[PDB]
Symmetry: D2
Subunit: 432 residues, 4 copies
């Protein structure tokens, strides 16, 4: 089968070693039960990571046959920018958007780490995602897409493993019993997946709808909800060239990673982009999360403001429709499937290519901001004798036949009982 239920003794197993008790304990346990574990750590520019080079060394200290750090920042930012160009975000609440940052991280991580293992002749994969979430399926799909011969082994789902190593306490004691003066970190009231595009918090106390953003200590921005933290209003300019974010506050960057890093700083000072979403997981059961994505939010606002001053209505409607559909595919782990690529490619080529301009905003607290200026050499919006009042009288008169058709429909609907009353005496009323 594709998924190995129990430890493949004697075989090389590649595991996404993010570091931390779960992956650390798994390395020792696998190495202990007879498997040859290889560690691969993705450099995703995590806002809460300050020493990536130390991670592969810890894997080696714990028995890894070999350990590698795969830099995925360039690809992550490129896909994040593509997501921005396509408005590929489907989970919204009252307009506030989740920027699908974890889904983007998985697309890049799942393909690059598996490709890297491919290089080292490692054909068995394993990551710590649970059998209850979306990530296990995202990694599964991206991995198999990259390596047709891939097999999956998740010690965390192996009954043998769980029997021995139940929870965090058993695992930390396991580290100690294995000869390592291990000291487990302080446990938060929620779990977090983070990368340069965003941080997603959920589980534990965030599973209760009565818990709010107040129990969260943001890692990409400030506590804007705390009236005691001072946040001075700030002006920022975002400029695009053919849809590509090239300048922030008039400054260009040597690469897009530095640009995103700066967009994150600007947005973070204000807590821009944070939202609270209840969403539908791939397995059709709901999950609740609190999300951060300051840089993505900043670019999203500027990009759409320009879009509204540049494209026609049919094109904007298609951008919203295709973007929402693509956002869902991205969330499902299908970002590289034909149905996704066709929408992504289309929006990048025909919509984003014309987004050249600059937007000036004043950021205050959280999602409270104002648009101060909008400029573009491609605007179709023009403050300024192409048509006359009489031309409009003609255009209005052309509507008469269809208006009559609708009036007759309203009469018909009232007749068959659908409407309480038509437009004859006022506002049509749908029978209740």
């Amino acid at each position: 089968t594709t998924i190995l239920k129990h430890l493949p003794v004697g075989q090389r197993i590649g595991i996404a070693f993010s570091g931390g008790l779960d992956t650390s304990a798994a390395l020792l346990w696998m190495r202990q039960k007879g498997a040859v574990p290889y560690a691969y750590t993705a450099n995703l520019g995590q806002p809460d990571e300050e020493d990536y080079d130390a991670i592969p060394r810890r894997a080696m200290e714990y028995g890894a046959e070999n350990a590698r750090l795969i830099d995925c920042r360039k690809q992550l930012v490129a896909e994040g920018i593509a997501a921005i160009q396509c408005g590929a975000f489907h989970n919204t609440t009252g307009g506030l958007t989740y920027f699908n940052t974890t889904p983007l991280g998985r697309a890049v991580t799942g393909t690059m780490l598996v490709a890297a293992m491919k290089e080292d002749g490692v054909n068995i994969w394993g990551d710590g995602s649970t059998y209850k979430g979306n990530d296990i399926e995202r990694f599964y799909r991206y991995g198999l897409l990259t390596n047709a011969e891939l097999q999956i082994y998740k010690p965390w789902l192996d009954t043998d493993f769980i029997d021995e190593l139940g929870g965090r306490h058993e695992m930390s004691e396991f580290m100690i019993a294995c000869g390592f003066d291990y000291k487990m970190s302080v446990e938060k009231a929620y779990s977090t997946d983070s990368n340069m595009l965003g941080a997603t918090h959920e589980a534990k106390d965030l599973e209760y709808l009565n818990s709010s953003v107040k129990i969260v200590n943001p890692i990409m921005g400030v506590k804007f909800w705390d009236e005691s933290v001072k946040i001075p209003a700030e002006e920022v300019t975002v400029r695009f060239e053919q849809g590509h974010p090239v300048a922030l506050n008039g400054k260009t960057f040597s690469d897009d990673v530095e640009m995103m890093l700066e967009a994150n700083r600007i947005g973070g000072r204000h807590g821009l982009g944070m939202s609270d979403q209840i969403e539908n997981r791939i397995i059709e059961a709901k999950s609740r999360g609190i999300y951060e994505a300051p840089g993505m939010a900043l670019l999203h606002i500027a990009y759409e403001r320009l879009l509204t001053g540049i494209h026609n209505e049919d094109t904007i409607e298609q951008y919203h429709a295709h973007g929402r559909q693509l956002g869902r595919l991205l969330y499902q782990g299908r970002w590289f499937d034909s149905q996704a690529l066709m929408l992504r490619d289309s929006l990048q080529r025909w919509v984003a290519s014309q987004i050249t301009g600059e937007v000036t905003l004043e950021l205050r607290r959280g999602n409270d901001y104002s648009i101060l200026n909008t400029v573009s050499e491609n605007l179709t919006y023009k403050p300024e004798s192409v048509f006359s009042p009489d031309d409009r009288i003609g255009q209005l008169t052309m509507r008469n036949l269809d208006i009559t058709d609708t009036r007759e429909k309203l009469f018909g609907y009232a007749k068959t009982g659908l409407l309480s009353s038509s437009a004859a005496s006022g506002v049509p009323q749908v029978e209740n």
Copy 2:
């Protein structure tokens, strides 16, 4: 024809008398040129109107054959609530929404005032909307829908009228010359259309993209962008029953108008809901506006938060798609056309009927707020042994055939040149 180009001497002409120089001068001029003008004023609960009863009297003072005040508040709020239940809002920028408040006002005004004229045997209609905007067409459609025999006469578009009465100065002098000690009001740097659902500001200085919300003096809320205005954080609860907004902060209301009035007060203290949009008019040319809708925004946020904890993904996707399409139809003046009614009715019956619950928010400045609690007897979201790890391994394995199909597609796309590279070595790349 339907549209009378020149004054119908001797005939009864009904005009939407909002009050103000344009309609006042038109009454005198029409009465002067030989027409019999009738005034109809819609009570829309305008936030900037404090004495509706005075308006019909001014029409009578100016020569109106008769003057009437048509109360449209109940219908306006009912349609506004329907819009909320359907998420019928299509103009969004970075998520910030325009709540189509003027379009909703026109649907109710255009049908009720024309129906009222019908009662008085008046079959000629006229309002002050320009030949350049959307309103002239909204009124046109709603009027004809209600009265098949309606004819339209807009003195403001009559060459004879414009020759004599050019601008505001000529008109005010006309009032004086006609024997009225008329005193024209202070002129703002933008025009405004307002009603109990919202206020829409545009034209004049707002036509420049360098002008911002800063030149606007909000009439439904506070200047949250001015750091000197104090705005204490405030907790608010919004509760729905089968999709109907019934309680704010635990209090119920004798009618929906009082509810909306209170939603407006709560939202207004914070400036909730204000946005700046560049949009596409019906005639396919762009327009820029700054909008207020505090109560609508408040209900919208609570309604969608509940929706996310109650409906499945396909149903939510259909709510967003149908709502955006309906929003556009609403904006086009087709709110009562079959293609709109079918979407509106559908969302009200199958989506809104299940929205029973309460949302607790903390409002701060503008659109900066936090969700504090979400409850519903209908939640499908549940913080809490229906499926096992092995059940998921099966579900994941069922994806294999299609994943292979996609891998082959990626190879094919790379072959025909579409992709630089497939997933074989990492992240697929669309050829640039």
Copy 3:
């Protein structure tokens, strides 16, 4: 768990007893291994069934604790008519449509037979659908929807069962060994699922794309592809009232089942509606089928012809879009889920309610037919001074601003390299 992997000894198990070796052998085997089997047979008006009453008796002869015949014809036809009103058909090839007849049969069968078992205190269900198709999942969903406590047991998927009773030969010998002078029928080169709405043929030799409709012996119509079968051209009239098919050739019926039965006869004489489709199963793997649905096809053609003479473009576009989406949900076994009901209800209320009229056709062979007449008291199509040439000049002139915007876009696209050339010298060309 929900699905019992092995025989629930001692328990009452309800099985969909269509009759035939598979269900017959299963009854004996289950009764033999210690289970108490109950038989439920759905009367679906199968075109190839001539003696339904005989089936429950055979179940009793084979050991059934009890046997029942559940009449599902009325419900089947009602859902088929709803499908017609909604154009709920998504699998089309060059326009030729699959009328989702098996999916409709499952929705009705899965709910009614399980509800019937409910009555007899039977809470374990089992049908002969394979683990490779769509039916196992349709029955699963409809059954659980009707009975929350339902458990599923499919002897045909029980390793114990397969070990003993492999194929048809082992089973027929099993019948003999169990004391029944059993004689298995003639085996066809494909399998068939049939009901009053249609017959679906697939599997066996139909799995090869080189096999065609020529290997099929149609059970609802004639072999129109065989030039030797004579098929006289025939005129037929189909009349609807508020979307309901009420008359065929000027004759009304005592009930809708008789109407569908007659629609089947008319269509069958010609082989109307037959198609060959390669489709995507729920598990994302393709399947090939040859389908019959003479009556459904007849009503579909008349219904849509009327629709085109009655509804406006936006409404027709929504009918096609919603119908295709609903067709897919129907095929997935989600015909009663909220996302389906909302589309179905909407189309029935606002689109079908106005479909009152009569269409006259001449049927010849297969899908070769001609429309001879179309009438409706609700037509908006009228062969017959509402607008003048000058009104149109105005309407055309109003397009100028946007045309300029598009011309500029074409220049822009040519500039960034998207287009080889704009419209400047002729036909714009997308860079290859």
Copy 4:
């Protein structure tokens, strides 16, 4: 203004000279009233045209300053093939499709003839389309797109012209009075627009819904409805390479025009593709037409059959949705607008690029045909141990949570009155 209401005396006016009384009489009349008329005739490979070179000569005989024949066949076929690749056809009745052949002809004609006039310094355009149809607006848009300075003058809409030259009789007498022994052709009971892609018949007697295809003498195919015309069954193979039609019956062609010409012959022998549609014109009023497009129909059927054996469900759903939307844009004259190009480009790149294969059909009469074989090196359909019965049990079990959610919804809908009954006792029933 853009549209000149009366003859521009002294100016060069370019007119689409198809030949025939209307354009011939207009040339003399314009040349007579003081204008300098230039003739441009599009070679569209009309099935009913046998001598294109003779047309410019007749224009010269009638006074044209100059006359040119612009060959548009290559471009017409290229756009027709693009339409096929995108399924850009929106008017369907019971599945039978209108292949938007006139709209495709206008896109190519309107741009190329205007571009040609551009070359000769002619900036005033005029064609014979009426102020009541779609063509006047298609030509208007395509012309202005190609030439920003274009002005339009249609003598047929000039009151002066109509006063003098009313109908066909007045015009033929005008030709005679102008010194030409003119002999007008036999008048048919309908009008026709034809090109190499198709022929569209409408107006006159076809305006009555009681007239049928029987009054039409097809110009691209045979009278398949006439039982006396013999039509031998015929086998045909259609093969594509990366979505491009390259071979018919195993033979390749020196160019696509020859390919389409042959596709037309094959389809024509059978009358394949003919349909009768009632549709919605751009001005929102219905029109009835009878259409021919034998070659387009042939390619459409083969193309879609391959599509169904090659692409996944999401991709096929997007092909149908985008194609229908694009078909409408094509019909509206917006084939080169951004909202159209984005859908067209997308379908060509991601869907059509993979359509490599061959389909074998047997054509009989009209749209009665059978699929005999389907082959493709890219099929994802495979008649032939990737997943086990137990894998499916897991996949089915994962549906439980959502099924419960739907069951609860059905209970809720029954409670609020929407449903008569839920699934508890059988088939859910929507309250009537």
